[PDB]
Curated annotation (Swiss-Prot), chain A:
Compartment(s): Nucleus; Cytoplasm
Gene name of the record: CHD1
Parent-protein start and end of this portion: 269 to 354 of 1710
Domain of life: Eukaryota
Tissue: Expressed in many tissues including in the brain, where the highest level of expression is found in the cerebellum and basal ganglia.
Protein name (record): Chromodomain-helicase-DNA-binding protein 1
Organism: Homo sapiens
Swiss-Prot record, chain C:
Residues the record lists as Phosphothreonine modifications: 3
Protein name: Histone H3.1
Positions bearing N6-acetyllysine: 4
Disease entry from the Swiss-Prot or TrEMBL record: Glioma: Gliomas are benign or malignant central nervous system neoplasms derived from glial cells. They comprise astrocytomas and glioblastoma multiforme that are derived from astrocytes, oligodendrogliomas derived from oligodendrocytes and ependymomas derived from ependymocytes.
Residues modified to N6-(2-hydroxyisobutyryl)lysine: 4
Residues bearing PTM N6-methyllysine: 4
Post-translational modification note: Acetylation is generally linked to gene activation. Asymmetric dimethylation at Arg-2 (H3R2me2a) by PRMT6 is linked to gene repression and is mutually exclusive with H3 Lys-4 methylation (H3K4me2 and H3K4me3). H3R2me2a is present at the 3' of genes regardless of their transcription state and is enriched on inactive promoters, while it is absent on active promoters.
Modification sites for Allysine: 4
Organism of derivation: Homo sapiens
UniProt subunit comment: The nucleosome is a histone octamer containing two molecules each of H2A, H2B, H3 and H4 assembled in one H3-H4 heterotetramer and two H2A-H2B heterodimers. The octamer wraps approximately 147 bp of DNA. Interacts with TONSL; CHAF1A; CHAF1B; MCM2 and DNAJC9. Interacts with NASP; NASP is a histone chaperone that stabilizes and maintains a soluble pool of Histone H3-H4 dimers.
Gene (name only): H3C1
List of residues that carry N6-crotonyllysine: 4
Length: 86, 177, 5, 175
């Protein structure tokens, strides 16, 4: 009942700001629609987001996050972040 | 951004004067009637109009325009109007004295392609929808177009798509949302 | 999404 | 001279490094072998794009890399960025696409790809020029299969006869 941990960085993208977290799971997107639907950079506020595969969770639970979201959730594996950034 | 761009010339016709622009999209026509309705070129008379596939808009958004409306809206890609006209003239001259068969083949092929193009405006499959919803409760839809590869899929206004493709929308959710 | 209003 | 410009992105693939350019046109392949022949995966790959050029018929499409494009000053590079995120968008979706959606996606891409190959096929010769190749051939106005007459184009004689001689002989029927 503590912190979540990053097992791997799967993808990267510039997406609608706020289009991260739980509403980003494949099942959330399929049920409630994609929160990043039709985004276009420089046509609206965008962000750099990373597709995260979580430790202990199959890929269907993967979510898009920002360095900021990872930080305020206190996830372990932030080193993964540093490496990926290059 | 900031001006529309001519991507391709899909057709040509002589229609009623002023029957151009937004009101000529297939959905405008389906919802409010064709501003070129009952145009018997035979006593009217019309003007040369061109059906335009716009850059960044799906074929469902194609509109009829004249050299004049194009210029008036400062669209980009005007050079394409010149090439189209020249190619058109070349085609006419080369089909001047052509066997009935040559005319036969030509009219056939033109219908095959004309039909093909019409399918570009028909949603073959909804692939996804948006999280956000219009004030009227419509989410936008990611459409797969008949006759075009997946690289041509595009997000479309929910209200618009529902007016003609409610089935595709229904099937989309049925295969489990 | 945009339409030819 | 001066510059070529990108019209459409017909496809992309991972292919042998250096397997781009003029030597990758169907008639180049047909006449001198395919530079990407037997590409293995035992060898360094490279993302390549199948380009349709403005002012040239599909018969002239070639594979290119983001690099060969910029090393030629090609116009329309902006389109490359759209095609890219577009492609990744469909690759991400593909990772979780239901089995029946994948099937649909596959059948549709089959059709699509076949249609595209037709564009490189002469469906009928509409006319020819008087000037003749530095000995040998006159040029031909070709009506391409799958494409409307507005896309007819003049093509080098010989280059056409090397494959569509039948269509050329047929054409000759003033009598």
């Amino acid at each position: 009942e503590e912190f979540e941990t990053i097992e791997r960085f799967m993808d990267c993208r510039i997406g609608r700001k706020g289009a991260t977290g739980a509403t980003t799971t494949i099942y959330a997107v399929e049920a409630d629609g994609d929160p990043n639907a039709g985004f276009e950079k420089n046509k609206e506020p965008g962000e750099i987001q990373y597709l995260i595969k979580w430790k202990g969770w199959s890929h269907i639970h993967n979510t898009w996050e920002t360095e900021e979201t990872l930080k305020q959730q206190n996830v372990r594996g932030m080193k993964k972040l540093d490496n990926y950034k290059k | 951004e900031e001006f529309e761009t001519i991507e391709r010339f899909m057709d040509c016709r002589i229609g009623r004067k002023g029957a151009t622009g937004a009101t000529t999209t297939i959905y405008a026509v389906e919802a409010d009637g064709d501003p070129n309705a009952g145009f018997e070129k035979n006593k009217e008379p019309g003007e040369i109009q061109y059906l335009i596939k716009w850059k960044g808009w799906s074929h469902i958004h194609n509109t009829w325009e004249t050299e004049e409306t194009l210029k008036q809206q400062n669209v980009r890609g005007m050079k394409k109007l010149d090439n189209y006209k020249k190619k058109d003239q070349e085609t006419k001259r080369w089909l001047k004295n052509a066997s009935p068969e040559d005319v036969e083949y030509y009219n056939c092929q033109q219908e095959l392609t004309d039909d093909l193009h019409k399918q570009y405006q028909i949603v073959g499959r909804i692939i996804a929808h948006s999280n956000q919803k219009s004030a009227a409760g419509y989410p936008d839809y990611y459409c797969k177009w008949q006759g075009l590869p997946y690289s041509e899929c595009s997000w479309e206004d929910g209200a618009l798509i529902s007016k003609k493709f409610q089935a595709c929308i229904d099937e989309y959710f049925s295969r489990k949302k | 999404a945009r339409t030819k209003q």
